[PDB]
Structure 1
Amino acid sequence: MFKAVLFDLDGVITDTAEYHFRAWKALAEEIGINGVDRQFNEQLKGVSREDSLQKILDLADKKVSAEEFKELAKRKNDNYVKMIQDVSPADVYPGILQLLKDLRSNKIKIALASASKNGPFLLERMNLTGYFDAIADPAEVAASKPAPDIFIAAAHAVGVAPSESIGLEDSQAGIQAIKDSGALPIGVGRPEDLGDDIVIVPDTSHYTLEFLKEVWLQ
């Protein structure tokens, strides 16, 4: 049986999509760029901060120096961090808390493998820190998803090989990263984004210990 489960944060444990959206909107409003509405924000989901900022500047063909770019990116982040002060246990996705409890009572290691620079803060706000055996520090890994580095680091941090682990993710790049780490992916979402070759559940309420055991056996 698997010895560890490696969790991404966003799209598995929770999301902060409304807060990122409000941050970018607020920034666009500040600088007088029209177009940054909910529909447009779909093009920013899971995209890097710098790429998201450039997409917004492009709406107005707007040209900016390195330092100005840096400052607008900082401004959006400051926005975002202020807004996530309201994250709470109610932000935990369906099924995850019970999964965590069951994993822990069966002595299965639990690790975070998230690019989020606010991972530990977010886990504290959701009251989930006591379940985590480790949090892979995204600042200490050479390469980001779909590179496997973060999943390797996470499994190693809890004393296991990735081949002993299940990885849970909602993105194609995450699922690839899990695959190449040597852990077993189980995706949440749809095959059109994630691929046909891995097990997928429609939502996180399907992530149960019983189900992860059935996948591992199979």
Structure 2
Amino acid sequence: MFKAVLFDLDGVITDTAEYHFRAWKALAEEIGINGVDRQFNEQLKGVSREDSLQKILDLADKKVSAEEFKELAKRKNDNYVKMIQDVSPADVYPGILQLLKDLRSNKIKIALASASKNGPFLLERMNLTGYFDAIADPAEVAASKPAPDIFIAAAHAVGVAPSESIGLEDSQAGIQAIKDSGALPIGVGRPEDLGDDIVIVPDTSHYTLEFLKEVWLQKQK
């Protein structure tokens, strides 16, 4: 039986993506840049905050000093941090609360493996801190998501090897990160984005202790 479950936050535990989208959109509008719609934002995923801001500036061929550049980047983050102040327990994805309860009562380790610099704050706002045994700190991770580093740090933080874990993800890079760490991935989304070689649930309400166990069993080969 697996000894720990490693959680990504966005797309699994809750949604932050919409908040990032709105923040960028507020910055753009603040400096009169138009075109940052739910279409363009799709090109801002898995990209750096610097690269994203640049893409946005390239929309209006807007030039700015390296100074004004860093300040714009900071503004986007401040908007984001302001926007997440209202995150609450109601924002927890379906099935997640019960899964955490079930894992805890089954003595299965729980760890956050997220790039979010606001992970601890967000879990406290959703009232989930007490379920987590460890939070892998994004700033201590040398290589981002595609790399297995963070799932490896998250597993070690709870005293297990990744090979004794299951990783829950909503992104292709995340799925790859889990595979390369040696943990068993179970994605949420659709094969077209995630891949055809892993178990996938359409929505998180299907992430139950019973389902995880059956998947872990049917893995033994």
Task: State the Cα distance separating 1:22 from its structure 2 match.
Answer: 1.7
Unpaired segments ≥5 residues, structure 2: none
Secondary structure at 2:150 match in 1? helix
The Cα of 1:136 is off from its aligned counterpart by 0.3
Q: Distance in 2 between matches of 1:27 and 1:68?
A: 13
The number of residue pairs the alignment matches comes to 218
Distance 2:129 2:182 in 1: 26
- Tell me the distance in 2 between the aligned counterparts of 1:65 and 1:147: 33
Cα deviations across residues 54-113 of structure 1 (Å, max 9, x unaligned)? Answer: 121111112233222211110000000011000000110000000000000000000000
TM-superposed deviation, 1:41: 2.3
Aligned partner of residue 166 in structure 2, secondary structure: strand
Distance 1:78 1:206 in 2: 35
Structure-2 separation of matches of 1:25 and 1:10: 19
Q: Structure 1 stretch 40-49 or stretch 193-202: which is displaced more?
A: 40-49
TM-score normalised by structure 2 residue count: 0.96
What displacement does 1:141 show?
Answer: 1.2
In structure 2, how many angstroms separate the alpha carbons of the residues matched to 1:35 and 1:148?
35
Q: Are 1:70 and 2:70 matched, yes or no? A: yes
Which ranges in structure 1 are unaligned for 5 or more consecutive residues? none
Q: Does residue 177 in structure 1 map to residue 177 in structure 2?
A: yes
Identity across the alignment (%): 100
The residue that corresponds to 1:53 in the other structure is 53
Residues of 2 paired with 1:17 and 1:91: CA distance? 13
- Report deviation, 1:44: 2.2
The answer to which of 32-41 and 115-124 deviates more is: 32-41
How far apart are 1:207 and its partner, in Å? 0.4
Task: Work out the CA distance in 1 between the residues paired with 2:186 and 2:50.
Answer: 29
Match of 1:129 in 2: 129
SS in 1 for 2:39: helix
Cα deviation, residue 191, structure 1 = 0.9
CA apart distance, 1:195: 0.6
CA apart distance, 1:188: 0.4
Q: What is the distance in 1 between the residues matched to 2:136 and 2:106?
A: 22
Most deviating of 169-178 and 45-54: 45-54
- Any idea what the Cα deviations from partners look like across 1:32-52, whole Å, max 9, x if unmatched? 111112332232244321222
Once the two structures are superposed, residues 109-128 of structure 1 have per-residue CA deviations (whole angstroms, 9 ceiling, x without a partner) of 00000000000000000000
TM-score (normalizing by structure 1)? 0.97
The aligned counterpart of 2:92 is 92
Q: Which moved more, 1:38-47 or 1:105-114?
A: 38-47
